[PDB]
DNA sequence: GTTTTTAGTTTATTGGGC
DNA sequence: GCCCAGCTTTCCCAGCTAATAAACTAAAAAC
């Protein structure tokens, strides 16, 4: 429902070491943090955010008592983020000249969550650290640190200049600073970070360590504070004597902008100053107006015009029993092709929460369909109001959970049987042998996968479903830009965004020659006639 | 902008003969199939013009008074009355109404018949695009006994082709089969097989009741220099309940609607350049020009930019986001597009790979990653194109479109329980077909309009094909249900 | 130019046991 | 019909938030 987050940033001397053309850790981390704070601000959540900085010249934190935890500053205390936070991040906060103990920074970060979440109810407490692990630090508080994170249910994530698992492109797909290019001090710091994450998360803890570069092209910084989805209760029925309590969640659902643009007067910049009046007139010539007390509702039936009031339509209107998830039958999965998928969502269906009997029952169905290579064709209706849908429910068996995946199928009235000329049997467009080989070479050069780490596994080199929809952070950059600089026009798209929307530089480079052969083998010219 | 389709039906003796079966006569099949197109054209607000002509009738009705040709319905937009009229010839009683209203089994000369049809295209006051004649007959050699007629029919058939009119043959079953090589090979403008069931005649006709209509013609850029043109089509599109329309009570005439915006104080009309866009966060206002709210949406120019090729196994079935589109080469814009396209298709198929692309449908729209999935052509036993050759444009979700969910311990069923369910699954097995279900809501909506436009005794009530046949299923399952329950549900549930 | 399609709004109707 | 449920930068008296899909309005591009 709400979450408490502490961004623990490293602004120590080393964070500014600028590589000829390659952004410094400080600037990279600064972009990641802005990315996170922007989304929290413009989405208007209730999450509370604090910002701790370490490696600063001064010292200002509630633990300095006794010349300890020096050069650690709590720049912002726990409270809703705002435009003043973003501005500081963008303009006020400067790089430091010192170096602080990063585990000490973490302790101060934990303190903020422990002393300030006081009374307030937070479902989640989280700490994100951004550092280059350049300096020395103490390891005497390790057990203390882990014991408090677990007991206080505080999760953790790390963000570094290098990945954990050539031309550098921020947010791109391909670079991997070899763990050899890092100093020895950094290798020590990294081992500790690894140990900590493994104690807190286990094997998957390694997955919570990111490079600033990859962070800019993921939603990982929000990962531990994401709004959990709402469940939909219902019974999966087979006949009228077999019911199975289930709960559905939406797996895929297009994310959309929430804030709408309000049209306002260019002078008062107020909404009340604007008003819209929609008038009616005889569409045919002699544009004569008509009063609202003379217009009725109607529909077209081909060339016919049929008056049908909303009152009459309300009663003759098709009406259903209501909510439901009824099996109509089962068929071979082959008879259901993905190209026929409909709707704007995917639903995962599980057994009702905490109902073992329902779970076993559903598990029976899932495995039977899987073992029979079949699927269920069902009637789905959100509620008594929603138009009912026919759809498919297919088995989804994993190691952590099992479920049915629901996707709507089409109604006959949704289909279009456009015939298209055959291309295989083409006596006009069949490619020559050379053209086929050029395309064959193009496809190999531009491969977006690779059987790496030799395990017969396919490594996707350009996994687009992990990349965030660019329109959002683009919108945020603009909204913020207009806020902090009203007279300035909108800024151009940030390069890292472009860098994440393009394939690995490796891919682009390999295709050049092949693309060149294709340009000469396949003549292409724009029509002048017809 | 309006395509034209004339339905031409043979009224010869054999059209009214089922040929001894549990099937309809070729004539009944034809009438019923024509009604269907009329109604579907209404369901989707199609603006095409439909016509209905019969030949071989004893009665004639056409502007030139050619004998044995009956123009039941001239080219015009379909409506309630025209549909109701066609229904009068449906079934065995219909057969009687048709024969008593026009007669049947009379002589005729195809040439005269085609002249009358071509003339219906000329009488159209509207401007037309495609001019098509669909012929329904189970006679494969009309004038094998009269060269004077056979010859005139070929000439006229040829004149149609030169004149831009297309003649499609919907040949119906005949003893020994319908042989197109005998006569129609030189008339029509692999061919579909003969139809013997309404179902088949319907699909073959549906495959031609509407011409291709691209959703957009775009450039598919392999890079900046190598660009081909493609058509994007929606082979699937959610048929919606047509929106209402405002009428003038005293004449039921449609009304125009003008929406203006004016300053509240002065009452003056507000130009688009007299208003700005606002968004309020916290206690701060951020103002942008309309032009800027569109600009922040701008990324790529409209088109498909190739990112590379990704093996199909890496694309998950459960990542569906919204309906897929279909991509086909548009040779009319960039000559050479089809060849390159075909090659890409042939090779993507052999390598079981997909073409990943950044897609922008129109100007000022953020990009979406899509996977062009190779799709090989498929014809069924009737020679109907079940699957068109090309690429399935599969939309890929961005990370934001994905939703996480917590999971508790995995609880699995025993082989004995899964076995019981297997037995149940096998009992309710059936053959799924993408066109087996009708939309309860749309159907009822038009049945309702029909009752109001034709003043029927009552609104026909649609049959919800989405509702499970409960009773039947229960009997079909027998004790399997009670059995399953004993293996899973504690009596104390 | 007019018509289909879609992103952007809009606002109410909706669940479920007793 | 009648209201449940909880949490607090509105306050614990109360207020009001929510989920989401059918409807509807507006702008781009196909024809």
mmCIF file with all atom_site columns, N, CA, C and O (backbone and C1' of nucleotides) in Angstrom, chain D residues 4-29:
data_model
loop_
_atom_site.group_PDB
_atom_site.id
_atom_site.type_symbol
_atom_site.label_atom_id
_atom_site.label_alt_id
_atom_site.label_comp_id
_atom_site.label_asym_id
_atom_site.label_entity_id
_atom_site.label_seq_id
_atom_site.pdbx_PDB_ins_code
_atom_site.Cartn_x
_atom_site.Cartn_y
_atom_site.Cartn_z
_atom_site.occupancy
_atom_site.B_iso_or_equiv
_atom_site.pdbx_formal_charge
_atom_site.auth_seq_id
_atom_site.auth_comp_id
_atom_site.auth_asym_id
_atom_site.auth_atom_id
_atom_site.pdbx_PDB_model_num
ATOM 1   P P     . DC D 1 4  ? -20.021 -0.231 6.730   1.00 0.00 ? 4  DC D P     1
ATOM 2   O "O5'" . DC D 1 4  ? -19.035 -1.431 7.098   1.00 0.00 ? 4  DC D "O5'" 1
ATOM 3   C "C5'" . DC D 1 4  ? -19.524 -2.594 7.772   1.00 0.00 ? 4  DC D "C5'" 1
ATOM 4   C "C4'" . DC D 1 4  ? -19.039 -3.847 7.079   1.00 0.00 ? 4  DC D "C4'" 1
ATOM 5   C "C3'" . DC D 1 4  ? -17.545 -3.844 6.754   1.00 0.00 ? 4  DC D "C3'" 1
ATOM 6   O "O3'" . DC D 1 4  ? -16.979 -5.129 7.017   1.00 0.00 ? 4  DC D "O3'" 1
ATOM 7   C "C1'" . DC D 1 4  ? -18.786 -4.189 4.758   1.00 0.00 ? 4  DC D "C1'" 1
ATOM 8   P P     . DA D 1 5  ? -15.383 -5.293 7.077   1.00 0.00 ? 5  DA D P     1
ATOM 9   O "O5'" . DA D 1 5  ? -14.898 -4.673 5.688   1.00 0.00 ? 5  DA D "O5'" 1
ATOM 10  C "C5'" . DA D 1 5  ? -13.812 -5.252 4.963   1.00 0.00 ? 5  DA D "C5'" 1
ATOM 11  C "C4'" . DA D 1 5  ? -12.545 -4.476 5.234   1.00 0.00 ? 5  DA D "C4'" 1
ATOM 12  C "C3'" . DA D 1 5  ? -12.344 -4.168 6.720   1.00 0.00 ? 5  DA D "C3'" 1
ATOM 13  O "O3'" . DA D 1 5  ? -10.986 -4.377 7.111   1.00 0.00 ? 5  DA D "O3'" 1
ATOM 14  C "C1'" . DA D 1 5  ? -12.419 -2.133 5.483   1.00 0.00 ? 5  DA D "C1'" 1
ATOM 15  P P     . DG D 1 6  ? -10.483 -3.876 8.560   1.00 0.00 ? 6  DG D P     1
ATOM 16  O "O5'" . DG D 1 6  ? -9.351  -2.832 8.165   1.00 0.00 ? 6  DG D "O5'" 1
ATOM 17  C "C5'" . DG D 1 6  ? -8.591  -3.028 6.972   1.00 0.00 ? 6  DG D "C5'" 1
ATOM 18  C "C4'" . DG D 1 6  ? -7.866  -1.759 6.604   1.00 0.00 ? 6  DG D "C4'" 1
ATOM 19  C "C3'" . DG D 1 6  ? -7.202  -1.089 7.805   1.00 0.00 ? 6  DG D "C3'" 1
ATOM 20  O "O3'" . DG D 1 6  ? -5.889  -0.656 7.452   1.00 0.00 ? 6  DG D "O3'" 1
ATOM 21  C "C1'" . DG D 1 6  ? -8.719  0.434  6.761   1.00 0.00 ? 6  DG D "C1'" 1
ATOM 22  P P     . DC D 1 7  ? -4.735  -0.589 8.575   1.00 0.00 ? 7  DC D P     1
ATOM 23  O "O5'" . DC D 1 7  ? -3.941  0.711  8.127   1.00 0.00 ? 7  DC D "O5'" 1
ATOM 24  C "C5'" . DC D 1 7  ? -3.875  1.071  6.749   1.00 0.00 ? 7  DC D "C5'" 1
ATOM 25  C "C4'" . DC D 1 7  ? -3.954  2.571  6.609   1.00 0.00 ? 7  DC D "C4'" 1
ATOM 26  C "C3'" . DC D 1 7  ? -3.338  3.282  7.815   1.00 0.00 ? 7  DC D "C3'" 1
ATOM 27  O "O3'" . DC D 1 7  ? -2.462  4.329  7.421   1.00 0.00 ? 7  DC D "O3'" 1
ATOM 28  C "C1'" . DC D 1 7  ? -5.551  4.062  7.455   1.00 0.00 ? 7  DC D "C1'" 1
ATOM 29  P P     . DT D 1 8  ? -1.342  4.849  8.452   1.00 0.00 ? 8  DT D P     1
ATOM 30  O "O5'" . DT D 1 8  ? -1.385  6.425  8.233   1.00 0.00 ? 8  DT D "O5'" 1
ATOM 31  C "C5'" . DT D 1 8  ? -1.661  6.958  6.938   1.00 0.00 ? 8  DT D "C5'" 1
ATOM 32  C "C4'" . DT D 1 8  ? -2.459  8.235  7.049   1.00 0.00 ? 8  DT D "C4'" 1
ATOM 33  C "C3'" . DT D 1 8  ? -1.941  9.215  8.103   1.00 0.00 ? 8  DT D "C3'" 1
ATOM 34  O "O3'" . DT D 1 8  ? -1.847  10.525 7.540   1.00 0.00 ? 8  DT D "O3'" 1
ATOM 35  C "C1'" . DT D 1 8  ? -4.258  8.810  8.444   1.00 0.00 ? 8  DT D "C1'" 1
ATOM 36  P P     . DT D 1 9  ? -0.543  10.917 6.677   1.00 0.00 ? 9  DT D P     1
ATOM 37  O "O5'" . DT D 1 9  ? -0.472  12.503 6.773   1.00 0.00 ? 9  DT D "O5'" 1
ATOM 38  C "C5'" . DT D 1 9  ? -0.671  13.177 8.010   1.00 0.00 ? 9  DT D "C5'" 1
ATOM 39  C "C4'" . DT D 1 9  ? -0.669  14.668 7.779   1.00 0.00 ? 9  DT D "C4'" 1
ATOM 40  C "C3'" . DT D 1 9  ? -1.668  15.134 6.722   1.00 0.00 ? 9  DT D "C3'" 1
ATOM 41  O "O3'" . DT D 1 9  ? -2.174  16.429 7.085   1.00 0.00 ? 9  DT D "O3'" 1
ATOM 42  C "C1'" . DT D 1 9  ? 0.527   15.635 5.992   1.00 0.00 ? 9  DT D "C1'" 1
ATOM 43  P P     . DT D 1 10 ? -3.113  17.240 6.059   1.00 0.00 ? 10 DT D P     1
ATOM 44  O "O5'" . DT D 1 10 ? -4.563  17.159 6.710   1.00 0.00 ? 10 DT D "O5'" 1
ATOM 45  C "C5'" . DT D 1 10 ? -5.729  16.925 5.912   1.00 0.00 ? 10 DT D "C5'" 1
ATOM 46  C "C4'" . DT D 1 10 ? -6.928  16.781 6.818   1.00 0.00 ? 10 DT D "C4'" 1
ATOM 47  C "C3'" . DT D 1 10 ? -6.705  15.681 7.863   1.00 0.00 ? 10 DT D "C3'" 1
ATOM 48  O "O3'" . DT D 1 10 ? -7.082  16.090 9.178   1.00 0.00 ? 10 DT D "O3'" 1
ATOM 49  C "C1'" . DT D 1 10 ? -8.660  15.203 6.576   1.00 0.00 ? 10 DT D "C1'" 1
ATOM 50  P P     . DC D 1 11 ? -6.157  15.673 10.431  1.00 0.00 ? 11 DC D P     1
ATOM 51  O "O5'" . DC D 1 11 ? -7.079  16.000 11.689  1.00 0.00 ? 11 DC D "O5'" 1
ATOM 52  C "C5'" . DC D 1 11 ? -6.866  15.366 12.951  1.00 0.00 ? 11 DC D "C5'" 1
ATOM 53  C "C4'" . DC D 1 11 ? -8.029  14.463 13.286  1.00 0.00 ? 11 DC D "C4'" 1
ATOM 54  C "C3'" . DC D 1 11 ? -7.838  13.017 12.838  1.00 0.00 ? 11 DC D "C3'" 1
ATOM 55  O "O3'" . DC D 1 11 ? -8.640  12.153 13.658  1.00 0.00 ? 11 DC D "O3'" 1
ATOM 56  C "C1'" . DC D 1 11 ? -9.694  13.881 11.761  1.00 0.00 ? 11 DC D "C1'" 1
ATOM 57  P P     . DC D 1 12 ? -8.923  12.512 15.210  1.00 0.00 ? 12 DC D P     1
ATOM 58  O "O5'" . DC D 1 12 ? -10.068 11.470 15.594  1.00 0.00 ? 12 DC D "O5'" 1
ATOM 59  C "C5'" . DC D 1 12 ? -11.307 11.455 14.876  1.00 0.00 ? 12 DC D "C5'" 1
ATOM 60  C "C4'" . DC D 1 12 ? -11.810 10.039 14.714  1.00 0.00 ? 12 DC D "C4'" 1
ATOM 61  C "C3'" . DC D 1 12 ? -11.694 9.196  15.982  1.00 0.00 ? 12 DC D "C3'" 1
ATOM 62  O "O3'" . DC D 1 12 ? -12.831 8.348  16.144  1.00 0.00 ? 12 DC D "O3'" 1
ATOM 63  C "C1'" . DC D 1 12 ? -10.309 8.267  14.252  1.00 0.00 ? 12 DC D "C1'" 1
ATOM 64  P P     . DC D 1 13 ? -13.836 8.603  17.378  1.00 0.00 ? 13 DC D P     1
ATOM 65  O "O5'" . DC D 1 13 ? -14.541 9.996  17.017  1.00 0.00 ? 13 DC D "O5'" 1
ATOM 66  C "C5'" . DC D 1 13 ? -15.862 10.300 17.483  1.00 0.00 ? 13 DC D "C5'" 1
ATOM 67  C "C4'" . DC D 1 13 ? -16.718 10.814 16.348  1.00 0.00 ? 13 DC D "C4'" 1
ATOM 68  C "C3'" . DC D 1 13 ? -16.628 9.990  15.058  1.00 0.00 ? 13 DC D "C3'" 1
ATOM 69  O "O3'" . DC D 1 13 ? -17.908 9.889  14.418  1.00 0.00 ? 13 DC D "O3'" 1
ATOM 70  C "C1'" . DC D 1 13 ? -16.113 12.226 14.585  1.00 0.00 ? 13 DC D "C1'" 1
ATOM 71  P P     . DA D 1 14 ? -18.081 8.947  13.115  1.00 0.00 ? 14 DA D P     1
ATOM 72  O "O5'" . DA D 1 14 ? -17.751 9.906  11.888  1.00 0.00 ? 14 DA D "O5'" 1
ATOM 73  C "C5'" . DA D 1 14 ? -17.838 11.326 12.013  1.00 0.00 ? 14 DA D "C5'" 1
ATOM 74  C "C4'" . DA D 1 14 ? -16.997 11.990 10.947  1.00 0.00 ? 14 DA D "C4'" 1
ATOM 75  C "C3'" . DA D 1 14 ? -17.347 11.542 9.529   1.00 0.00 ? 14 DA D "C3'" 1
ATOM 76  O "O3'" . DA D 1 14 ? -17.264 12.644 8.621   1.00 0.00 ? 14 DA D "O3'" 1
ATOM 77  C "C1'" . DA D 1 14 ? -15.084 10.955 10.005  1.00 0.00 ? 14 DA D "C1'" 1
ATOM 78  P P     . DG D 1 15 ? -17.908 12.510 7.154   1.00 0.00 ? 15 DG D P     1
ATOM 79  O "O5'" . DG D 1 15 ? -16.632 12.421 6.195   1.00 0.00 ? 15 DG D "O5'" 1
ATOM 80  C "C5'" . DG D 1 15 ? -15.683 13.494 6.122   1.00 0.00 ? 15 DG D "C5'" 1
ATOM 81  C "C4'" . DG D 1 15 ? -14.540 13.122 5.203   1.00 0.00 ? 15 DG D "C4'" 1
ATOM 82  C "C3'" . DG D 1 15 ? -14.995 12.483 3.886   1.00 0.00 ? 15 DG D "C3'" 1
ATOM 83  O "O3'" . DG D 1 15 ? -14.215 12.930 2.769   1.00 0.00 ? 15 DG D "O3'" 1
ATOM 84  C "C1'" . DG D 1 15 ? -13.586 10.966 5.064   1.00 0.00 ? 15 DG D "C1'" 1
ATOM 85  P P     . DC D 1 16 ? -14.781 12.717 1.270   1.00 0.00 ? 16 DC D P     1
ATOM 86  O "O5'" . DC D 1 16 ? -13.472 12.638 0.367   1.00 0.00 ? 16 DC D "O5'" 1
ATOM 87  C "C5'" . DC D 1 16 ? -12.201 12.326 0.933   1.00 0.00 ? 16 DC D "C5'" 1
ATOM 88  C "C4'" . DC D 1 16 ? -11.827 10.894 0.623   1.00 0.00 ? 16 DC D "C4'" 1
ATOM 89  C "C3'" . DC D 1 16 ? -12.572 10.274 -0.565  1.00 0.00 ? 16 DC D "C3'" 1
ATOM 90  O "O3'" . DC D 1 16 ? -11.666 9.474  -1.325  1.00 0.00 ? 16 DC D "O3'" 1
ATOM 91  C "C1'" . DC D 1 16 ? -12.701 8.845  1.258   1.00 0.00 ? 16 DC D "C1'" 1
ATOM 92  P P     . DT D 1 17 ? -11.726 9.494  -2.935  1.00 0.00 ? 17 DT D P     1
ATOM 93  O "O5'" . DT D 1 17 ? -10.183 9.479  -3.323  1.00 0.00 ? 17 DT D "O5'" 1
ATOM 94  C "C5'" . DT D 1 17 ? -9.190  9.439  -2.302  1.00 0.00 ? 17 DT D "C5'" 1
ATOM 95  C "C4'" . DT D 1 17 ? -8.895  8.005  -1.925  1.00 0.00 ? 17 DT D "C4'" 1
ATOM 96  C "C3'" . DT D 1 17 ? -8.937  7.041  -3.113  1.00 0.00 ? 17 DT D "C3'" 1
ATOM 97  O "O3'" . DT D 1 17 ? -7.806  6.173  -3.067  1.00 0.00 ? 17 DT D "O3'" 1
ATOM 98  C "C1'" . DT D 1 17 ? -10.234 6.179  -1.370  1.00 0.00 ? 17 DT D "C1'" 1
ATOM 99  P P     . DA D 1 18 ? -7.437  5.297  -4.358  1.00 0.00 ? 18 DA D P     1
ATOM 100 O "O5'" . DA D 1 18 ? -8.732  4.386  -4.538  1.00 0.00 ? 18 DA D "O5'" 1
ATOM 101 C "C5'" . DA D 1 18 ? -9.120  3.478  -3.509  1.00 0.00 ? 18 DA D "C5'" 1
ATOM 102 C "C4'" . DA D 1 18 ? -9.481  2.149  -4.118  1.00 0.00 ? 18 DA D "C4'" 1
ATOM 103 C "C3'" . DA D 1 18 ? -8.755  1.912  -5.436  1.00 0.00 ? 18 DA D "C3'" 1
ATOM 104 O "O3'" . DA D 1 18 ? -8.294  0.572  -5.514  1.00 0.00 ? 18 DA D "O3'" 1
ATOM 105 C "C1'" . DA D 1 18 ? -11.083 1.726  -5.777  1.00 0.00 ? 18 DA D "C1'" 1
ATOM 106 P P     . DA D 1 19 ? -7.510  0.093  -6.823  1.00 0.00 ? 19 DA D P     1
ATOM 107 O "O5'" . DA D 1 19 ? -8.644  -0.633 -7.676  1.00 0.00 ? 19 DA D "O5'" 1
ATOM 108 C "C5'" . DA D 1 19 ? -9.154  -1.898 -7.267  1.00 0.00 ? 19 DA D "C5'" 1
ATOM 109 C "C4'" . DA D 1 19 ? -9.754  -2.619 -8.451  1.00 0.00 ? 19 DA D "C4'" 1
ATOM 110 C "C3'" . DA D 1 19 ? -8.913  -2.513 -9.724  1.00 0.00 ? 19 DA D "C3'" 1
ATOM 111 O "O3'" . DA D 1 19 ? -8.857  -3.784 -10.383 1.00 0.00 ? 19 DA D "O3'" 1
ATOM 112 C "C1'" . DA D 1 19 ? -11.086 -1.563 -10.093 1.00 0.00 ? 19 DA D "C1'" 1
ATOM 113 P P     . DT D 1 20 ? -8.163  -3.909 -11.827 1.00 0.00 ? 20 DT D P     1
ATOM 114 O "O5'" . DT D 1 20 ? -9.366  -3.578 -12.812 1.00 0.00 ? 20 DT D "O5'" 1
ATOM 115 C "C5'" . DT D 1 20 ? -10.659 -4.125 -12.563 1.00 0.00 ? 20 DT D "C5'" 1
ATOM 116 C "C4'" . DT D 1 20 ? -11.654 -3.610 -13.574 1.00 0.00 ? 20 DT D "C4'" 1
ATOM 117 C "C3'" . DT D 1 20 ? -11.072 -3.415 -14.972 1.00 0.00 ? 20 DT D "C3'" 1
ATOM 118 O "O3'" . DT D 1 20 ? -11.985 -3.936 -15.922 1.00 0.00 ? 20 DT D "O3'" 1
ATOM 119 C "C1'" . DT D 1 20 ? -12.243 -1.492 -14.325 1.00 0.00 ? 20 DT D "C1'" 1
ATOM 120 P P     . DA D 1 21 ? -11.443 -4.819 -17.143 1.00 0.00 ? 21 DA D P     1
ATOM 121 O "O5'" . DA D 1 21 ? -12.736 -4.938 -18.059 1.00 0.00 ? 21 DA D "O5'" 1
ATOM 122 C "C5'" . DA D 1 21 ? -14.016 -5.163 -17.470 1.00 0.00 ? 21 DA D "C5'" 1
ATOM 123 C "C4'" . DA D 1 21 ? -15.029 -4.188 -18.024 1.00 0.00 ? 21 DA D "C4'" 1
ATOM 124 C "C3'" . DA D 1 21 ? -14.946 -3.966 -19.535 1.00 0.00 ? 21 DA D "C3'" 1
ATOM 125 O "O3'" . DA D 1 21 ? -16.267 -3.882 -20.053 1.00 0.00 ? 21 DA D "O3'" 1
ATOM 126 C "C1'" . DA D 1 21 ? -14.865 -1.892 -18.440 1.00 0.00 ? 21 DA D "C1'" 1
ATOM 127 P P     . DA D 1 22 ? -16.587 -4.423 -21.527 1.00 0.00 ? 22 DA D P     1
ATOM 128 O "O5'" . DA D 1 22 ? -17.911 -3.622 -21.900 1.00 0.00 ? 22 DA D "O5'" 1
ATOM 129 C "C5'" . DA D 1 22 ? -18.984 -3.529 -20.964 1.00 0.00 ? 22 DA D "C5'" 1
ATOM 130 C "C4'" . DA D 1 22 ? -19.613 -2.157 -21.017 1.00 0.00 ? 22 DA D "C4'" 1
ATOM 131 C "C3'" . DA D 1 22 ? -19.953 -1.676 -22.429 1.00 0.00 ? 22 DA D "C3'" 1
ATOM 132 O "O3'" . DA D 1 22 ? -21.237 -1.032 -22.440 1.00 0.00 ? 22 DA D "O3'" 1
ATOM 133 C "C1'" . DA D 1 22 ? -18.524 -0.106 -21.382 1.00 0.00 ? 22 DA D "C1'" 1
ATOM 134 P P     . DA D 1 23 ? -21.827 -0.443 -23.819 1.00 0.00 ? 23 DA D P     1
ATOM 135 O "O5'" . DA D 1 23 ? -21.859 1.124  -23.555 1.00 0.00 ? 23 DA D "O5'" 1
ATOM 136 C "C5'" . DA D 1 23 ? -20.701 1.791  -23.068 1.00 0.00 ? 23 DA D "C5'" 1
ATOM 137 C "C4'" . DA D 1 23 ? -20.925 3.283  -23.036 1.00 0.00 ? 23 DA D "C4'" 1
ATOM 138 C "C3'" . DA D 1 23 ? -21.187 3.902  -24.407 1.00 0.00 ? 23 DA D "C3'" 1
ATOM 139 O "O3'" . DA D 1 23 ? -22.061 5.040  -24.288 1.00 0.00 ? 23 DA D "O3'" 1
ATOM 140 C "C1'" . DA D 1 23 ? -19.046 4.585  -23.599 1.00 0.00 ? 23 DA D "C1'" 1
ATOM 141 P P     . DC D 1 24 ? -22.395 5.942  -25.587 1.00 0.00 ? 24 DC D P     1
ATOM 142 O "O5'" . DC D 1 24 ? -21.212 7.012  -25.601 1.00 0.00 ? 24 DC D "O5'" 1
ATOM 143 C "C5'" . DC D 1 24 ? -20.803 7.655  -24.392 1.00 0.00 ? 24 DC D "C5'" 1
ATOM 144 C "C4'" . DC D 1 24 ? -19.609 8.546  -24.644 1.00 0.00 ? 24 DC D "C4'" 1
ATOM 145 C "C3'" . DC D 1 24 ? -19.637 9.291  -25.980 1.00 0.00 ? 24 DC D "C3'" 1
ATOM 146 O "O3'" . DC D 1 24 ? -19.253 10.643 -25.772 1.00 0.00 ? 24 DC D "O3'" 1
ATOM 147 C "C1'" . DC D 1 24 ? -17.569 8.235  -25.715 1.00 0.00 ? 24 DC D "C1'" 1
ATOM 148 P P     . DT D 1 25 ? -19.641 11.754 -26.858 1.00 0.00 ? 25 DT D P     1
ATOM 149 O "O5'" . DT D 1 25 ? -18.268 12.523 -27.093 1.00 0.00 ? 25 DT D "O5'" 1
ATOM 150 C "C5'" . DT D 1 25 ? -17.507 12.985 -25.985 1.00 0.00 ? 25 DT D "C5'" 1
ATOM 151 C "C4'" . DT D 1 25 ? -16.094 13.301 -26.413 1.00 0.00 ? 25 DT D "C4'" 1
ATOM 152 C "C3'" . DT D 1 25 ? -15.980 14.102 -27.711 1.00 0.00 ? 25 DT D "C3'" 1
ATOM 153 O "O3'" . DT D 1 25 ? -15.043 15.165 -27.537 1.00 0.00 ? 25 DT D "O3'" 1
ATOM 154 C "C1'" . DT D 1 25 ? -14.619 12.175 -27.843 1.00 0.00 ? 25 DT D "C1'" 1
ATOM 155 P P     . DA D 1 26 ? -14.810 16.217 -28.726 1.00 0.00 ? 26 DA D P     1
ATOM 156 O "O5'" . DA D 1 26 ? -13.352 15.861 -29.266 1.00 0.00 ? 26 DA D "O5'" 1
ATOM 157 C "C5'" . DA D 1 26 ? -12.250 15.728 -28.365 1.00 0.00 ? 26 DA D "C5'" 1
ATOM 158 C "C4'" . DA D 1 26 ? -11.032 15.207 -29.093 1.00 0.00 ? 26 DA D "C4'" 1
ATOM 159 C "C3'" . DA D 1 26 ? -10.716 15.915 -30.410 1.00 0.00 ? 26 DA D "C3'" 1
ATOM 160 O "O3'" . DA D 1 26 ? -9.301  16.031 -30.552 1.00 0.00 ? 26 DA D "O3'" 1
ATOM 161 C "C1'" . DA D 1 26 ? -10.952 13.618 -30.814 1.00 0.00 ? 26 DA D "C1'" 1
ATOM 162 P P     . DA D 1 27 ? -8.683  17.146 -31.531 1.00 0.00 ? 27 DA D P     1
ATOM 163 O "O5'" . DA D 1 27 ? -7.637  16.322 -32.401 1.00 0.00 ? 27 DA D "O5'" 1
ATOM 164 C "C5'" . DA D 1 27 ? -6.653  15.508 -31.769 1.00 0.00 ? 27 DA D "C5'" 1
ATOM 165 C "C4'" . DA D 1 27 ? -6.095  14.509 -32.753 1.00 0.00 ? 27 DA D "C4'" 1
ATOM 166 C "C3'" . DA D 1 27 ? -5.756  15.104 -34.121 1.00 0.00 ? 27 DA D "C3'" 1
ATOM 167 O "O3'" . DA D 1 27 ? -4.534  14.530 -34.584 1.00 0.00 ? 27 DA D "O3'" 1
ATOM 168 C "C1'" . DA D 1 27 ? -7.217  13.289 -34.404 1.00 0.00 ? 27 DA D "C1'" 1
ATOM 169 P P     . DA D 1 28 ? -3.865  15.056 -35.948 1.00 0.00 ? 28 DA D P     1
ATOM 170 O "O5'" . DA D 1 28 ? -3.301  13.717 -36.590 1.00 0.00 ? 28 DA D "O5'" 1
ATOM 171 C "C5'" . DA D 1 28 ? -2.858  12.652 -35.756 1.00 0.00 ? 28 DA D "C5'" 1
ATOM 172 C "C4'" . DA D 1 28 ? -2.884  11.361 -36.532 1.00 0.00 ? 28 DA D "C4'" 1
ATOM 173 C "C3'" . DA D 1 28 ? -2.392  11.542 -37.965 1.00 0.00 ? 28 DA D "C3'" 1
ATOM 174 O "O3'" . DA D 1 28 ? -1.550  10.458 -38.334 1.00 0.00 ? 28 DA D "O3'" 1
ATOM 175 C "C1'" . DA D 1 28 ? -4.615  10.692 -37.982 1.00 0.00 ? 28 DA D "C1'" 1
ATOM 176 P P     . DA D 1 29 ? -0.606  10.596 -39.618 1.00 0.00 ? 29 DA D P     1
ATOM 177 O "O5'" . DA D 1 29 ? -1.284  9.592  -40.656 1.00 0.00 ? 29 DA D "O5'" 1
ATOM 178 C "C5'" . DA D 1 29 ? -1.496  8.227  -40.291 1.00 0.00 ? 29 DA D "C5'" 1
ATOM 179 C "C4'" . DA D 1 29 ? -2.569  7.594  -41.147 1.00 0.00 ? 29 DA D "C4'" 1
ATOM 180 C "C3'" . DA D 1 29 ? -2.370  7.680  -42.664 1.00 0.00 ? 29 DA D "C3'" 1
ATOM 181 O "O3'" . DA D 1 29 ? -2.754  6.431  -43.250 1.00 0.00 ? 29 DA D "O3'" 1
ATOM 182 C "C1'" . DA D 1 29 ? -4.502  8.476  -42.111 1.00 0.00 ? 29 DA D "C1'" 1
#
